[PDB]
């Protein structure tokens, strides 16, 4: 019990520290040096901002576990729950948009001149938040504070019937934030890898093939990290809903660990997208 509580507290704390340090540092390099003069760097700023706000919601979950009750209050409970549901969709939609961004840059070069501009990148990023607002706003209203066994519970309450509306939310989160993004990321990157091999510049030399392999290596790592982190939590929620499982000590650790993996991708998104970025890498070399 006590050993389990320390392990859960440590697991969330490590994820929270790395995530806040990674997200804010990327937003510091962009503002102080890059100055948002590039369309691609605009997407990276929205990616870092959405992951930062999702990581900001993580110490509230840490206090909720150890105490067993929510002391913050109703108004904070509405905002804290909403940000977790909101910035989850915003961060994932940014990944889908950047996947479409990289797809058009390779496969459709003439159309990429109109598409990949600073003017258009600002417009499409605003549209991501608006679509995110569809699932962001009703969570704000529904979230309340319910007393369970003498302990306040910061959760979501649905209109009668409860079973129909509550499960519908989970299925919508399942389909729209997991099934559709995995398909969009895999197909766009998968077609891109085929086109990159065809390109004369990348191939044609032994040294050139090394750089081509590295690009293919980077793409697959990004796809693998997204699938490895998001898949356990989504399947576990569906299993928990359909079949009631006994509250074993091991079961409690698994539930929080799956949530830790969910934010781990957000923590690891600056490293893959921004730290491994060639433009950012040059900037680190530039100032020493």
């Amino acid at each position: 019990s006590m050993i389990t509580a320390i392990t859960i507290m440590a697991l969330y704390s490590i994820v929270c520290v790395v995530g806040l340090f990674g997200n804010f540092l990327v937003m510091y390099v962009i503002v102080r040096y890059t100055k948002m003069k590039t369309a691609t760097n605009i997407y990276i700023f929205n990616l870092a901002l959405a992951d930062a706000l999702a990581t900001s919601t993580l110490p509230f979950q840490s206090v909720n576990y150890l105490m067993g009750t929510w002391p913050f209050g109703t108004i904070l409970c509405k905002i804290v729950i909403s940000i977790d549901y909101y910035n989850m969709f915003t961060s994932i939609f940014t990944l889908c948009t950047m996947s479409v961004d990289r797809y058009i840059a390779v496969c459709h070069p003439v159309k990429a001149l109109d598409f990949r501009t600073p003017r258009n990148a600002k417009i499409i990023n605003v549209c991501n938040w608006i679509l995110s607002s569809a699932i962001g706003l009703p969570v704000m209203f529904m979230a309340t504070t319910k007393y369970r066994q003498g302990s306040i519970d910061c959760t979501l309450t649905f209109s009668h019937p409860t079973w129909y509306w509550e499960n519908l939310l989970k299925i919508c989160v399942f389909i729209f934030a997991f099934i559709m993004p995995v398909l969009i990321i895999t197909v766009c990157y998968g077609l891109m890898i085929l086109r990159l091999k065809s390109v004369r510049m990348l191939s044609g030399s032994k040294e050139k093939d090394r750089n081509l392999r590295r690009i293919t290596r980077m793409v697959l790592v990004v796809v693998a990290v997204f699938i490895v982190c998001w898949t356990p939590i989504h399947i576990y929620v569906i299993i928990k809903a359909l079949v009631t499982i006994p509250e074993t000590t091991f079961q409690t650790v698994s539930w929080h660990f799956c949530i830790a993996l969910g934010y781990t991708n957000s923590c690891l998104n600056p490293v893959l997208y921004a730290f491994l970025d060639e433009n950012f890498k040059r900037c680190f070399r530039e100032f020493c």
Binding site: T38, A39, T40, A105, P109, V110, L113, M201, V219, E278
Partner: peptide, 18 residues
């Protein structure tokens, strides 16, 4: 089509994969 290859290289540099 030579120009198209240059555009693809420029876009990848812009994206930062290359």
């Amino acid at each position: 089509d030579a120009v198209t290859d240059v555009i693809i290289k420029n876009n990848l540099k812009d994206c930062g994969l290359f």
